[PDB]
Every structure is written in C-alpha cells, then in structure tokens.
Scaffold this active site. Structure first.
Site, PDB file in Angstrom:
ATOM      1  CG  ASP A  97      -0.231   0.091   2.566  1.00 36.02           C
ATOM      2  OD1 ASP A  97       1.007  -0.042   2.570  1.00 36.02           O
ATOM      3  OD2 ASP A  97      -0.945   0.374   3.571  1.00 36.02           O
ATOM      4  CB  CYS A 143       4.811  -2.699   2.724  1.00 38.08           C
ATOM      5  SG  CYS A 143       6.131  -2.869   1.507  1.00 38.08           S
ATOM      6  CG  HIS A 149       5.247  -6.305  -1.971  1.00 43.32           C
ATOM      7  ND1 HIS A 149       5.071  -6.318  -3.331  1.00 43.32           N
ATOM      8  CD2 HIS A 149       4.001  -6.352  -1.443  1.00 43.32           C
ATOM      9  CE1 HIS A 149       3.768  -6.318  -3.612  1.00 43.32           C
ATOM     10  NE2 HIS A 149       3.092  -6.338  -2.471  1.00 43.32           N
TER      11      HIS A 149
HETATM   12  C1  LIG Z   1       6.358  -1.495   0.628  1.00 39.89           C
HETATM   13  C2  LIG Z   1       5.266  -1.205  -0.184  1.00 39.89           C
HETATM   14  O1  LIG Z   1       4.143  -0.736   0.289  1.00 39.89           O
HETATM   15  N1  LIG Z   1       5.268  -1.338  -1.527  1.00 39.89           N
HETATM   16  C3  LIG Z   1       4.238  -0.846  -2.415  1.00 39.89           C
HETATM   17  C4  LIG Z   1       4.348  -1.447  -3.800  1.00 39.89           C
HETATM   18  C5  LIG Z   1       4.560  -0.843  -5.038  1.00 39.89           C
HETATM   19  C6  LIG Z   1       4.503  -1.873  -5.966  1.00 39.89           C
HETATM   20 BR1  LIG Z   1       4.768  -1.750  -7.942  1.00 39.89          BR
HETATM   21  C7  LIG Z   1       4.333  -3.153  -5.483  1.00 39.89           C
HETATM   22  S1  LIG Z   1       4.127  -3.224  -3.748  1.00 39.89           S
END
Ligand SMILES: *CC(=O)NCc1cc(Br)cs1
Length: 225
Positions: free
Chosen positions: A43, A46, A219
C-alpha cells in the site's frame, strides 16, 4: 490478517512466480538460510509497517532490551520538536506508538501485537509516527545526509514529499535514518529478476541484525532465520 499475514513456509512464495527460472533459483537459495516468511500489504507503507512489527516482535520476553527501547522512545518527542514539529500535531501518533511498546512489556503475546498491526486505525497511526521520526532525524542531521549520501540534494523538500506523506515509497536514505533513529539493526535480502547472486545489505554496516526483510517486486516481507 490483511496488513501483516500469518507465518508461511519460505517455499510457499514459489506460487507467486510460476515457471520463472531466476525467481525459482533465488527463492530455493533463500530457503537454505531462512525457514519462514510473513507477507505485508503493498500500500506504499510496507517498509514502515514491516520494520515496526518485526522489531517489536523480536523484543517479546526480553526485559532489559524492552526497558532500554522504552527509554529511547520516551525521548523521541524531543527529536520531533528540535526539527520544527509541533506537539499538538504529533501527540496522537506518538501516543499510539508508545501504547504498542507498553503492550510488548505488559501483554507480551504475538497474538496481541499482530492484532494491533492489523487494526487499520492503530497501525496507520504507528506508521505515521515512524514517518515523522524519520523526517525529524534526517532534518536534524542534514549535513550528514548531504556529506555521505546527498551533496546536491535538497533535504527539506525531500522530507516533505518523500518521507512525511502516507503511501510514499522508501529508498536507502529512509531505511538508514529510521534504523539510526531507533537503534534497530536490520538486514535486507534482495531478490530481483536479473541473473545475479542473491545478496543482502546490513543497516548499520557493522551490525548483528534483529530484523530480516525480503525486498522483492517493490515489497518488503518479513523473514525468519
Ligand atoms: C512497501 C510497499 O508498500 N510497496 C508498495 C508497492 C509498489 C509496488 Br509496484 C508493489 S508493492
């Protein structure tokens, strides 16, 4: 468990990259060093959400380490004030973080900690606190981020646009700053689709890590050794 998942076997993430030779190779190699993973919601928050949960999970049951962490957290309002943040604007976010640190001391269960980090309201208040502390720590050490990272960079604008707002993605500067601000040692494993070695970086460079994260498809997921 929509923001931070239950623990799964490492090889369970093969299904995320079916019929991909590089990702299969690198995930098989990762499985030789780590036994389990937790997924996080992608989101834009992360990194903050994964580091906060994983570090506090690592403190459960460790009475001296909890006492020393709590002592540091009680001083963080002074870092925010020194950088120009006003108390009545950070109060609600600070109080949510201090509350979850007291939970680690008083309750001490994984189940109670995971429930706070999966409560959208509590969890987003915690993330917002971590972002404001990141910002403050950078602002108060602007020459250090310019000398060692950033000679040509505009520090104040960077923090306004790429640290403070919810859903803004991280790079090395934010990771280095939040690690330093809370004295958290972390190791990040990198899994990309180039035909290269599986590799990692430790923040700070010296350190024995508390927290392991996997960085894959933008992520940050949590790893267990
Ligand atoms: C850490 C996090 O929230 N990542 C967000 C994202 C952007 C993409 Br493309 C995949 S997950």
């Amino acid at each position: 468990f929509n923001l931070i998942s239950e623990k799964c076997d490492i090889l369970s993430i093969l299904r995320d990259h079916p019929e991909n030779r590089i990702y299969r190779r690198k995930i098989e190699e990762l499985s030789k060093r780590f036994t389990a993973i937790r997924k996080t919601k992608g989101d834009r928050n992360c990194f903050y959400r994964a580091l906060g949960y994983s570090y506090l999970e690592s403190l459960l049951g460790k009475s001296r380490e909890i006492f020393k962490f709590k002592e540091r957290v009680l001083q963080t309002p002074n870092d925010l004030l020194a950088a120009g943040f006003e108390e009545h604007k950070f109060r609600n976010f600070f109080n949510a973080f201090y509350s979850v640190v007291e939970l680690v001391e008083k309750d001490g269960s994984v189940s109670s900690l995971l429930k706070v980090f999966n409560d959208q309201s509590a969890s987003d208040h915690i993330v917002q606190f971590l972002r404001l502390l990141t910002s403050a720590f950078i602002r108060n050490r602007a020459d250090f981020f310019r000398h060692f990272i950033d000679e040509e960079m505009d520090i104040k604008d960077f923090c306004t646009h790429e640290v403070e707002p919810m859903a803004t993605e991280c790079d090395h500067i934010q990771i280095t700053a939040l690690s330093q601000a809370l004295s958290i040692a972390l190791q990040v494993e990198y899994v990309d689709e180039m035909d290269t070695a599986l590799n990692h970086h430790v923040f700070p460079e010296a350190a024995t890590p508390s927290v392991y994260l996997l960085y894959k498809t933008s992520h940050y997921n949590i790893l267990y050794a």
